Amino acid sequence: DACVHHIKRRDIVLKWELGEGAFGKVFLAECHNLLPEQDKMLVAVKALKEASESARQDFQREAELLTMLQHQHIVRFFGVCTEGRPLLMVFEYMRHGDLNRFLRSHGPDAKLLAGGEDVAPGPLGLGQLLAVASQVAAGMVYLAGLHFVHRDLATRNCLVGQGLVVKIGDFGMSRDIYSTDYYRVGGRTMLPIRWMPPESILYRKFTTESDVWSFGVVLWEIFTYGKQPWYQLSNTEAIDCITQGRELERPRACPPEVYAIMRGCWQREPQQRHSIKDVHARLQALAQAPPVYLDVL
Numbered sequence: 001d002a003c004v005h006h007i008k009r010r011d012i013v014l015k016w017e018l019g020e021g022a023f024g025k026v027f028l029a030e031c032h033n034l035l036p037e038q039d040k041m042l043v044a045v046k047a048l049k050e051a052s053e054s055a056r057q058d059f060q061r062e063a064e065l066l067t068m069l070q071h072q073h074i075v076r077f078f079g080v081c082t083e084g085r086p087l088l089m090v091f092e093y094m095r096h097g098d099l100n101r102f103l104r105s106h107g108p109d110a111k112l113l114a115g116g117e118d119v120a121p122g123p124l125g126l127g128q129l130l131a132v133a134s135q136v137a138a139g140m141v142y143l144a145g146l147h148f149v150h151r152d153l154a155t156r157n158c159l160v161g162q163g164l165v166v167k168i169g170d171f172g173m174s175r176d177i178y179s180t181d182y183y184r185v186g187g188r189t190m191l192p193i194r195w196m197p198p199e200s201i202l203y204r205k206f207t208t209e210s211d212v213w214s215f216g217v218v219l220w221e222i223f224t225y226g227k228q229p230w231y232q233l234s235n236t237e238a239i240d241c242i243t244q245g246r247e248l249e250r251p252r253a254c255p256p257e258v259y260a261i262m263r264g265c266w267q268r269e270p271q272q273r274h275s276i277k278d279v280h281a282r283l284q285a286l287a288q289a290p291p292v293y294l295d296v297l
């Protein structure tokens with residue numbers, strides 16, 4: 001509560017709504033006197049929907065976590081606004097939205113119409129995809145370092161910004177645009193089953209090793225340009241396939257070495273999976289490698 005930075009309401013000017021959840025409305029806003037170099041900048045502002053009693057504590061833990069967890073590929077948190085209501089959380093605005101939307105909007109069958117400023121026309125090339133994957137991996141190295149377990153790693157939970165800087169976040173399981181990416185158990189609990197390893201589905205254990213599995217699935221989302229994992233399957237069919245040891249096929253756009261990295265994440269025994277530090281190293285080696293090398297994959 002003391003560690004969390006505070007922003008005066010007068011310094012925040014709401015412009016329009018960006019999105020909406022069950023836990024809050026997100027707005028694009030101007031924030032004044034937040035930084036030295038920038039006299040005025042753009043921010044995402046989550047206004048708390050104070051309906052339930054516990055939402056105020058979730059707000060608090062979110063703001064506390066995001067004040068502690070800060071890194072180049074984690075969503076940037078600037079502080080809260082507690083003076084008056086509704087309570088506001090203030091974030092760095094990422095102009096391309098979520099990585100899933102971005103991947104789909106530069107998929108295959110994308111002509112010269114897509115592109116400009118920070119991305120080329122049409123389908124993202126191998127270098128761009130490896131760049132995306134390396135950044136996410138870097139963010140997961142950091143969380144792995146602090147022994148944080150994400151539990152909902154997926155492209156829909158990654159933001160993309162100016163110059164394709166990618167940062168990991170977590171936007172609840174609240175937005176209805178991605179409700180089919182969860183399996184509703186009974187009432188209110190939602191499970192991202194298609195991203196989950198067999199030990200998480202069967203035994204309900206979430207660890208650093210279950211995140212690496214999920215990164216593996218993010219790597220497949222990236223190389224399928226935002227395709228849902230197991231899109232051909234219903235939820236229960238997916239649970240069956242994942243628990244019975246079935247693996248997602250190599251995507252068309254994905255070369256063998258990168259599929260090898262995915263398979264590294266998908267070892268059935270958690271112990272046998274490669275560390276996120278190794279995966280990042282491999283991807284960044286690939287991301288930064290010269291054109292001559294990459295053209296031969």
Ligand SMILES: CC(C)(C)c1cc(NC(=O)CSc2nnnn2-c2ccc(O)cc2)n(-c2ccccc2)n1
Nearest residue numbers: 026044046062074075091092093094168169170171
């Ligand atoms: C870092 C970690 C993965 C642990 C994480 C991140 C978050 N939180 C986020 O990622 C909210 S980002 C966000 N929220 N509202 N709007 N918005 C938004 C919209 C568009 C933009 O361009 C920019 C921002 N958590 C977390 C922790 C506890 C409870 C809930 C979430 N954990």
